[PDB]
C-alpha cells in the first residue's frame, strides 16, 4: 500500500525539519505550490519540478551531513531511492519506472543546472569575490548587496560606520565621570572603539590561523576553484597553493 506523492513529500520535508519556505528557498518551487502539492489541491507534478525538489534536499543534506566521502555515497544513493519513491507514488503518472533511465536523467538534469548557476555567478564574480552577497543560511540561494555587510572581517576593518554590540556588555567608555553627558552618546554607548575592533580582529585572525589553512593568493585560488575545469585536475592545483 503506497502513499500519494504529496504524503511522501511532507514526510521527507518534515523528517529533515525543513519548513515549506526553507524548502522553497533550497528548491526553485514556490511556497504556495509546495503547500498545494502536500494537500492534494494540486495533482501529481511535472518530472522537472520533482527534480528541482530533490536538488532542494540535495543542497540541504550536503549542508547538514556533509559532502565528505563516507556520506557522499550515502547521499547520492539516498536521493536516488527518494526519486524512485516519488515516481512509485499511488497517484504517479510515470509507468517508464525503469529507475536507471530516471536516475541517469536526473544526474544529466543536475549537471545542466550546475552549468547555468556557474554562468550566472561568473557575471557577478566581482560581488561574489568581494563578499558583496546576502547568502541565505543553509542554502546556495544568494542576493547581491551594495556592501559586504555579512563579511565579519570587513565589519571589523571598515572605517565608514560605527560598529555596536548588544545594549549589554557596554559603557565602552570607562570614562563615565565627564560632567555633562557626551552629546548624543547617551544613545550610542554601544560603539566599539578602533582599539577593541583590532584586538577582536587579531584574536579571530589567530584563532582561525592555528586551524584551517591560510590562502597566499586570493585572486588566484578563487579563479581556479570557480570554472568548467575537471574536479580531479583542480584539486591538485588547490593543494599546490596550500602546500608548495
Amino acid at each position: 500500500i503506497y502513499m500519494t506523492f504529496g504524503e511522501i513529500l511532507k514526510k521527507e520535508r518534515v523528517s529533515w525539519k525543513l519548513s515549506v519556505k526553507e524548502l522553497s528557498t533550497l528548491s526553485g518551487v514556490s511556497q504556495t505550490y509546495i503547500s498545494k502539492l502536500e494537500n492534494g489541491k494540486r495533482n501529481f507534478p511535472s518530472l522537472e519540478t520533482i527534480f528541482n525538489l530533490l536538488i532542494g534536499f540535495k543542497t540541504h543534506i550536503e549542508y547538514k551531513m556533509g559532502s565528505e566521502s563516507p556520506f557522499y555515497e550515502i547521499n547520492n544513493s539516498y536521493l536516488d531511492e527518494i526519486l524512485i519513491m516519488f515516481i512509485n507514488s499511488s497517484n504517479s503518472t510515470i509507468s517508464d519506472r525503469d529507475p536507471n533511465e530516471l536516475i541517469t536523467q536526473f544526474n544529466e538534469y543536475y549537471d545542466v543546472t550546475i552549468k547555468k548557476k556557474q554562468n550566472e555567478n561568473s557575471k557577478i564574480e566581482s560581488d561574489i569575490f568581494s563578499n558583496k552577497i546576502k547568502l541565505v543560511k543553509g542554502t546556495t540561494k544568494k542576493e547581491v548587496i551594495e556592501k559586504p555587510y555579512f563579511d565579519l572581517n570587513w565589519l571589523l576593518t571598515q572605517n565608514e560606520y560605527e560598529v555596536f554590540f548588544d545594549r549589554s556588555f557596554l559603557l565602552d567608555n570607562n570614562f563615565l565621570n565627564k560632567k555633562h553627558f557626551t552629546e548624543k552618546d547617551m544613545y550610542y554607548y554601544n560603539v566599539l572603539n578602533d582599539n577593541d575592533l583590532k584586538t577582536i580582529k587579531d584574536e579571530i585572525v589567530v584563532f582561525l590561523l592555528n586551524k584551517y589553512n591560510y590562502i597566499k593568493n586570493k585572486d588566484d585560488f578563487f579563479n581556479i576553484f570557480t570554472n568548467s575545469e575537471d574536479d580531479k585536475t583542480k584539486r591538485d592545483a588547490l593543494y599546490k597553493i596550500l602546500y608548495e
Binding site: 514526510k11 523528517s15 529533515w16 547538514k64 550515502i74 539516498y78
Partner: protein, 44 residues
C-alpha cells in the same frame, strides 16, 4: 540496533530512510562502524 535508531533521526535531524542508510554502512558490524558512527556524530 533493533528499531532503536530513532536516536539518530532526532539528534542528526535526518529522515528515517537516511538513518537506515547510515546503519546500512558496516550493518551488524556496529563495532567496525563506531569509527565512522563517531565522526560527524562526534565533532557535531
Amino acid at each position: 540496533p533493533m528499531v532503536t535508531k530513532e536516536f539518530l533521526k532526532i539528534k542528526l535531524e535526518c529522515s528515517d530512510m537516511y538513518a537506515q542508510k547510515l546503519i546500512d554502512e558496516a550493518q551488524g558490524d556496529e563495532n567496525k562502524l563506531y569509527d565512522l558512527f563517531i565522526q560527524k556524530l562526534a565533532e557535531r
